Write a protein that binds this ligand. Structure first.
Ligand SMILES: C=C(/N=C/c1c(COP(=O)(O)O)cnc(C)c1O)C(=O)O
Ligand SMILES: C=C(/N=C/c1c(COP(=O)(O)O)cnc(C)c1O)C(=O)O
Ligand SMILES: *N[C@@H](Cc1ccc(O)c(F)c1)C(=O)O
Ligand SMILES: *N[C@@H](Cc1ccc(O)c(F)c1)C(=O)O
Ligand SMILES: [K+]
Ligand SMILES: [K+]
Ligand SMILES: [K+]
Ligand SMILES: [K+]
Lengths: 455, 455, 455, 455
C-alpha cells in the first residue's frame, strides 16, 4: 500500500524541463560530476534530503514573524519549549545546523585519548570526535554491514561489542556512546526501542554518557511504530519522547527531520554541561538564544518539528521512498536492502558489473541517470571515499552506490516514477554504460569539484 | 501517457478527513448544498478551479513587490503590457474578477431588447446579459448538449445557427457574439481555431462585435495544439495570440487560467468603449489603474498568465484531469465525454437513473459524494440553470452533471486515485441516492446558497 | 505633543530619490498632472490613504495562511467573528472594497423616488444612491461648509434639518440616513457619539433606517476619545462598538481604517436584508464567504481591523497628520481647519491668490509640490469637479484644494518635514507659481488623464 | 542637516513598554546583564546592529526565490558574483555569520606563536586568533583610545607601531595584519583610504598578508566620501571596491552592512588558501556552496550588499546615528566622539565618575538605562575586554562605554528622540547608579552570559 500525499500543494517551485540532448550538454559542462550541475538545470534533485525540504503554510507564516533580536527572541523561546516538550531534554542550545552542534558536543564531552563508540558513523560527527582526541569504535551489529540483508532494525548496536569495549578499555576511558537514528551509512536503517533501552541500561550501570545523533529520529520513530511489536498503539510523538528518554542529550540537524532548510540544535540534561555549552556556543555559532540562526528560522524549526510528529506525514514520507525502492526491486535493479527512511541506494557495483571500481561505476551511473531523466543523484562510492594522501591510492569502499535521496514534501509518486522508469530503462541496457576517468582531480574534497571524461 | 508534474512542491498545506458520521451532520447542516459546506470540513476540495490555484515561487516573489499606489503602479504597467503582448488587445481594464468585467461589458455593449448569442450559457455571464436587457440565444452545435458523445471541439459555434439568428433578427439587433473558451458547462470543451476564424468572418461581414470569455483560454489553446490539424508545432503563446485576433475584446477571470487566487480584467480594441469602460469601472471596481485589485495581485496575475504559456505546465494540467476521467471511465462510471480541460463531469442522469431531473439528481449526487468521500464537488445541472425569467419554470438542460473541478498545481495523481477510488465504490450502490426538493431558493443565481431537503 | 511611532520598521519599500531637475522632467512627461505620475518616480506618495497602508508582521503571517477555498474559507470565518465582535453587527458580507458594499446596500435599501440624507456625501456612495432612484439631501450642520472654522465634530448631522426632511417628505419616503465617519468632503471631520445617538433616536421613532459609511470610523473614534467629554475612560474598541450600536448596518472600506491594501464589507442586523444581500453579492462580488477577496485578504483585514483598535496606533496616526497641519499653519500656509484624521488640505485658492480658478491653482500647486519635494498630492478642485457636459462649463467648487493624504504606518515625521518644508518654501515665493491650461482634456474622468501646460 | 528616510515603510512590528516595576524585576532576573533580558520585555532594542536590520521589499522577494539545492544554487551564484563585483576578491566562501569566517581564517593563516596585529581588538576576532596560537598586538594609534578626542579617522593604524612590530619580531613571525572597517570598539570609527594604502605598501614590502574585518565597510566608505579629501565625487561602490584592493582577503558579517538578519562570508585571492578554506568549511559550516546558510539567505545578502551601496541609504544611516549623538551632546551627556557609523557610545567613566572601572560602570549603566527607559543597550568596557590569558587579571581598556546600537532601517528620528530624552533625564541623577560584581563569570567571551550583583 502507498498512501496519497497527506497535504496539498500550496505553492510550486519553477523548474526547467530541458530535454535529453541539452541535459547531455549540461552533464558534459559539469564534467560528468552531478555535484557540479547547476540547480537551475535539474528537474528532480535527489542529491540530498538535507535542507531541501518543502515547508508548510504554517511555517511560512512563522517566517513572517521572525523576532530578530540578538538575545531573548520569542522564536527561541518557542523552539526551546517545543524541543523540551517533544524530546524531553532539559536544556537546548540552537546551532545553525547539525555539525555545529556536533562541534559543541565533542569539545564538551571528550578528553583526549578517550573512546567514542557508535552504530557506525557519519563523516562530520566522527571528524569532530577525532579532532577532539577520541578514538572511534564501531559497535553496530554485524548484519548492518551486509548491504543485501533484508532484516528489521539493522541499525541496532551489538550489546556484546559494547560490553567488550567497556571491559577492554574501561568505563572511565569512554567519552560517550554515539547512537545515530537512523543509521545513514547502512542506508538509513532504524534502531529499535529495545536496543535503545538496552544500551541505556548497560551504559548507566557504568556511568557512561549516551548522546543521540537524532537527525532522522522521526523516520526512525515511524519504523518503530510500523515494525516493533508493542508500538501499534503509540503515537509518533510518544515514540520520539521515549526514544530520547534513553539518552543524556543529542545533536540534531533540523535540516532533515525538522522539515526546514537550515537549523539544528544541541540538547542535554546536565546543568553543568549546559552551562559549558552556553560558554562555547558564542565562540562558533552565536548567542544561546539564536545560535547562528535568524529568529524566523528558529520559528520555522519549532513549527516543523511539531509537524513531523503527524503520523500521516511520516508514513507517507517513508512509504514514498519505499515506493521507489519497491519499483526498482521489482524490475531486478540491485539496491541496498532494506530501503531506509530517506533514500534508495543503487548498487552500482552490481548495476555496472562490466566496469571495475577504478572506472567509477557509481559516478558514471549517476551521470547517466541525469542525462536520461533530469534526476540528480549523489555518488557514494570510490570518488566520495577520497584518496589516501600518504600512499596516493584510492580509498576503496565496499559500498559502490548511487544515493537517490528524497527531500521531504517536495516530490510526488509521479516524480518517483520518472526516477524509477529512467533507472529501469538504463538497467535494461546496463552494459552500454561507459567507465569514467579523471580529467581534473583536486587534492581534497574531490567529490565536490572533480571532472571526468568517458574511457 | 501521463506526465509527471513539471514543477516541484515549494510549500504545502495539510489535508484531513473527518469521520463519515460528522460529514453526514455537516451535509444536512449545509442543507445538502455543497456550496454551503465549510473549507475545514473537506479533505480534497474539487468545488471549483476558480481562485483555488497554487502560485509559484516567482508569483510569491512578485507578491512581496506590491506597489500599492492608487495610480501608476509598476504592477499595473506589468499587467497591462503582459496582456497586450500575450492577448494582443489594445486596451485593458483590470477588474477584481471575471464577473466584474462581465458587468462592465454588458452595460457597455447591450441595448435593451437586443440579442446576445453564445456557445452555451454561463450563470454569471447570462445574468449580466439579461439584467441589461438582452435575450440570450444559444448557438453552440447540438452535439455539445449530449454528455456521452465523444467528439472533438464540442465548444464550436454552429455557423448555421449564427447565420439564422442574423437572418431572422437582423445584425443591428444583436449586441455581440459571446464566444467562450473553453465552454465550461459543456464539460470544459474546447473551440477550434477554424471555428473562431469562421465566426470572425461571418460577424465582421455584418458589423457584429465578438467578445470572448477568455477564462480558460489556455486550456483551450492546449486542445488546439493537441488535436487541430496544423497546430502541432505552434507554441501555446502563438495559439493564444492567434485565438484572440478573431475577437473585439474579452472578459477574463484571472482566477482560472492566470494561476491566481483573485483577479480578472476586461480587454477591448475600441477607443470609445475603453473610455466608457474607465468611467464605469470607477463605480463598481476602482480606478482604472487597479480595478479593485491590490498591486501585488495585478503582479501575481501578470506573472501567472505568462507561466500558463509553458507547454509542459498546461499539458500536465489537462492530462491530470484526463487521468481522473480515464480511471472513472475504465471502471464504467458514466462521465461527460470527452474530458474537458478543468474538470471531470459525472453524468448524474446515468449515475442516478432512478431519479428524474425534477428530483435534482446532480445536486443530490454531489451531497452523497461528500458524505461517502469527504471530497467536495459542484452541482452543474438544473439547479445551476436557473429559472426562465418569463414562465417561472426550471430551465431544463440535457446536461445534468456533478463537477469534479481540479485547481491548477494543487493535487497529485495519487489524490486523483483517491477521488476515483471513492467514486468507483459509490457507483456500486447508486440506487441509494435520494431525490431533493427546495426549502430555500434564491431569486437569482440560486445554486450558490439554495437549501434543499430529501423528498 | 507628537508621540513616537508605536511600532518599528519590519521591512522597507525601495524608492527612487531622483533629484529636482529629473522630477521636473517626470512632471512634464505627466503633463503637470500628478495623477499621471509613475509610482516608481515618487518619493512620498500622498495621493490617497486608500489601500496604501503598511501591514504588520502579523498581517503578513496571515497572508501566508490564505485558505483559498471558494466557499467556507477559514479566513472568512475569522473576518466574520472579528467584525461581529468589534462592530457588533449580526451579519457581514465581504466585498472587494467599499464601493462594492455601497452597490449592494443601495440596491437592497432604496425604492425609486425615495430620499437618502447624509452628513455631506462621498462620490461613489452618492452615485450608487442616485443610480438606484434616490434623491440625496445634505443634512450636515451648516458649520461643516465653513472650511476655515476651527470647531470640534464638524461632521455632525443637524437634527433640525433631519426633522425638516421627515416632516416635508414623510418617513416612508426616506430610504435611509447615510451617516459617514469621518466626513471626507469636509476635510475628514469627525462625528460625536452624542450626534450618533440623537440621530438614532430620531430615526427610530419614525422607523427610518440608518447606515454608516464607516470607512474612517477608527479615526472618528480617536477624535471622540480625545475631545468628547465623558470618553476619557473608554477604549477605542469600546467607542467603536458604541458608535455602531446606533446604526442598522454599514458599508466599510477596509482599504482605509482596516490597515490593508484591498478589502471591504457590508454589515447589517436585519435577517431578511442579509438574505437578500447574499442573493445579490454573488452577482457582482463573489460568494457570501469571499465576496471578491482572496482568502489571504479577508485574513489580513480581520487582523488589521483588530490592530486598528490599539490606542497608541490610532493616536499616532491622527497626530502625525496633525503634525503636518500644525507645521504648515505655523508658517502661515492656508489649510482647511480643523485638520482631519487622514489628510491635510491646502487652500490653493488662497495659496495662489494671484491665479484665477480657471487657471487651476490646485492642479498647479500639486505639480509644484512634486517638483520641489518628490511628494505627490491630489488635486481636489476645479479639475476633479469635472465639466458640465450639457453646458460645457466647469463645475466650480467652492473648495479649491490640494489634498495631502497620509497612508497609515507608511511615513515618518521626517517625511512630514520633507512635505511641510517644501510647501513652506513654495509659500514664501507663492507669487511665482504659474497657471495651467488644458492641452488634453478627456470627455470624462478628466482628473485621471488630463494634461496641462503653463500659461 | 538630517535627511529623511530614503525609503518608505512597507511593513511594521509593534513596540511596547512594560512598567518600571516590571523592568526592575526583569533586570535583576537577568542578573543585571542586558544580554540576558528577553526581547518581548524591551521597547526599543539597541543591544546591537548585528542581524537586527530591516530588509527591503526586493530582499523579501528574493526570500521567496530560495533555491535550496545543496550545490549549484542560483542563490550561491548570485552571492558569489555580487561579492566578486563589489569587493573585487577572487574567491568567496559563505559562512553562517562573521565568526564562522573568523574561525576559518584563524585556522588557515596562523602558525602557533605568531603575531596578529590589528587596529584595536574585537571579542570574537581576538578569541579565534588566540585560540589558534597567535599573540594579538594593537597597532591602532593612541588617539583611538581616548573617548572624548574628536579627530577624524580614529580607526587608522599607526604606521610607526606597525613598523616597530616588523622590526622587533620579524615579518615571518607575523601571521597577518587585521584591519577592521569601521573599528567597532573605538566607537565605530572609520579608517582612511590613505591609511589602507600605506598599510598595504608597508606590508607588501615585507611579504605580510592583510585581511580586513569588512563587517561595517560601507559605513566606513561613507566616512571616506564625507571627509577624506579627493573622495567627495566618488560613489560608495567605487570607494568600497578601492578599499578592498589593499587587502588579501576579508571576513564579513553580512549581519551588519549587508542589511540581513543572518549570514557572512570569507573572501580571499589566494588559490591555495581557498582550497584549504573549502576543506575546513565543510567541518564547521557546510558545503562551500551554502556555508551554513539557506539559499534564501544567500539571496537576501547578495541583494542587501548591493542596496547598501546606495548613497542616500548610507548617508541617512550614519546621520540618524549622528542625530542621536548630537542631541545627547547638546545636553551635556558625555559620549565617545566623533560619533561612529553604527552606534552612540555613552562615556560610562564620566556618566559614572563616582565608580571605578572595577565596579563595572559600563555594565551598571546599561542595566540602569533599561530600568529607567526600557531601551536596551550593550556593555562595551572591562566586561567585554575579557581577562589576560597569562595573568588572569581584567584587561583594562580606557574606553568604558555603553553602546546605543542602531539597527539599519528599523527606527525613526522620533525613536531617537525617545532614547535621547530618556538618557538626558537619567543623566540628572547619575550618582544613583551602583557598582556591580561578578556572581557568575564564563571562562571566555564572558560578557555574553555573565551574571552580576550590586556591591
Ligand atoms: C466560478 C466559476 N466560474 C467562473 C466563470 C466566470 C466568472 O468569473 P469570476 O468567478 O471570476 O467572476 C466567467 N466565465 C466563466 C466561463 C467562468 O467559468 C466556476 O466554474 O466555478
Ligand atoms: C555582534 C557584534 N559584532 C559582531 C562582529 C563580528 C562577528 O560577527 P558575527 O556576529 O556575525 O559572528 C566581527 N567583527 C566585528 C567588527 C563585529 O562587530 C556586535 O558588535 O554587536
Ligand atoms: N548529512 C547530509 C549532508 C551532508 C553532510 C556531509 C557531506 O559531506 C555531504 F555531502 C552532505 C547528508 O546525508 O547529505
Ligand atoms: N475613497 C478613497 C478612494 C477614491 C475614491 C474615488 C475617487 O474618485 C478617488 F479618486 C479616490 C479616497 O478618498 O481617495
Ligand atoms: K538549504
Ligand atoms: K480564492
Ligand atoms: K492598493
Ligand atoms: K537575527
Amino acid at each position: 500500500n502507498y498512501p496519497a500525499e497527506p497535504f496539498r500543494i500550496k505553492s510550486v517551485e519553477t523548474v526547467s524541463m530541458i530535454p535529453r540532448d541539452e541535459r547531455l550538454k549540461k552533464m558534459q559542462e559539469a564534467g560528468y560530476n552531478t555535484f557540479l550541475l547547476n540547480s537551475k538545470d535539474i528537474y528532480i534533485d535527489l542529491l540530498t534530503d538535507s535542507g531541501t525540504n518543502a515547508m508548510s503554510d504554517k511555517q511560512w507564516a512563522g517566517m513572517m514573524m521572525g523576532d530578530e533580536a540578538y538575545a531573548g527572541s520569542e522564536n527561541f523561546y518557542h523552539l526551546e519549549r517545543t524541543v523540551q516538550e517533544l524530546f524531553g531534554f532539559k536544556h537546548i542550545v540552537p546551532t545553525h545546523q547539525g555539525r555545529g552542534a556536533e562541534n559543541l558536543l565533542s569539545q564538551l564531552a571528550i578528553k583526549p585519548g578517550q573512546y567514542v563508540a557508535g552504530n557506525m558513523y557519519f563523516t562530520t560527527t566522527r571528524y569532530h570526535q577525532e579532532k577532539n582526541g577520541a578514538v572511534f569504535v564501531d559497535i553496530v551489529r554485524d548484519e548492518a554491514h551486509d548491504a543485501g540483508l533484508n532484516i528489521a532494525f539493522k541499525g541496532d548496536i551489538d550489546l556484546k561489542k559494547l560490553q567488550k569495549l567497556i571491559d577492554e578499555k574501561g568505563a572511565e576511558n569512554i567519552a560517550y556512546i554515539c547512537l545515530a537514528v537512523t543509521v545513514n551509512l547502512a542506508g538509513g536503517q532504524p534502531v529499535s526501542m529495545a536496543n535503545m533501552r538496552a544500551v541505556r541500561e548497560l551504559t548507566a550501570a557504568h556511568g557512561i554518557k549516551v548522546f543521540y545523533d537524532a537527525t532522522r529520529c522521526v523516520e526512525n520513530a515511524y519504523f518503530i511504530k510500523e515494525q516493533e511489536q508493542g508500538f501499534e498503539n503509540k503515537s509518533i510523538a510518544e515514540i520520539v519522547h521515549e526514544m530520547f528518554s534513553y539518552a543524556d542529550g543529542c545533536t540534531m540537524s533540523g535540516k532533515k527531520d525538522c522539515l526546514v532548510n537550515i537549523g539544528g540544535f544541541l540538547c542535554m540534561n546536565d546543568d553543568e554541561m549546559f552551562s559549558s555549552a552556553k560558554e562555547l556556543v558564542v565562540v562558533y555559532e552565536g548567542m544561546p538564544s539564536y545560535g547562528g540562526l535568524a529568529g524566523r528560522d528558529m520559528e520555522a524549526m519549532a513549527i516543523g518539528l511539531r509537524e513531523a510528529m503527524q503520523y500521516e506525514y511520516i508514513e507517507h514520507r517513508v512509504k514514498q521512498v519505499r515506493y521507489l525502492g519497491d519499483k526498482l526491486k521489482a524490475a531486478g535493479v540491485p539496491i541496498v536492502e532494506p530501503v531506509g527512511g530517506h533514500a534508495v541506494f543503487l548498487d552500482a557495483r552490481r548495476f555496472c558489473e562490466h566496469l571495475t571500481q577504478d572506472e567509477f561505476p557509481a559516478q558514471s551511473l549517476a551521470a547517466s541517470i541525469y542525462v536520461e531523466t533530469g534526476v540528480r543523484s549523489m555518488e557514494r562510492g570510490i570518488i566520495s571515499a577520497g584518496r589516501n594522501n600518504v600512499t596516493g591510492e584510492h580509498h576503496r569502499p565496499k559500498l559502490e552506490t548511487v544515493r537517490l535521496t528524497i527531500p521531504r514534501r517536495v516530490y510526488t509518486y509521479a516524480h518517483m516514477d520518472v526516477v524509477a522508469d529512467g533507472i529501469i530503462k538504463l538497467y535494461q541496457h546496463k552494459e552500454d554504460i561507459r567507465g569514467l576517468k579523471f580529467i581534473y582531480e583536486p587534492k581534497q574534497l574531490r567529490f565536490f569539484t572533480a571532472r571526468f571524461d568517458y574511457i
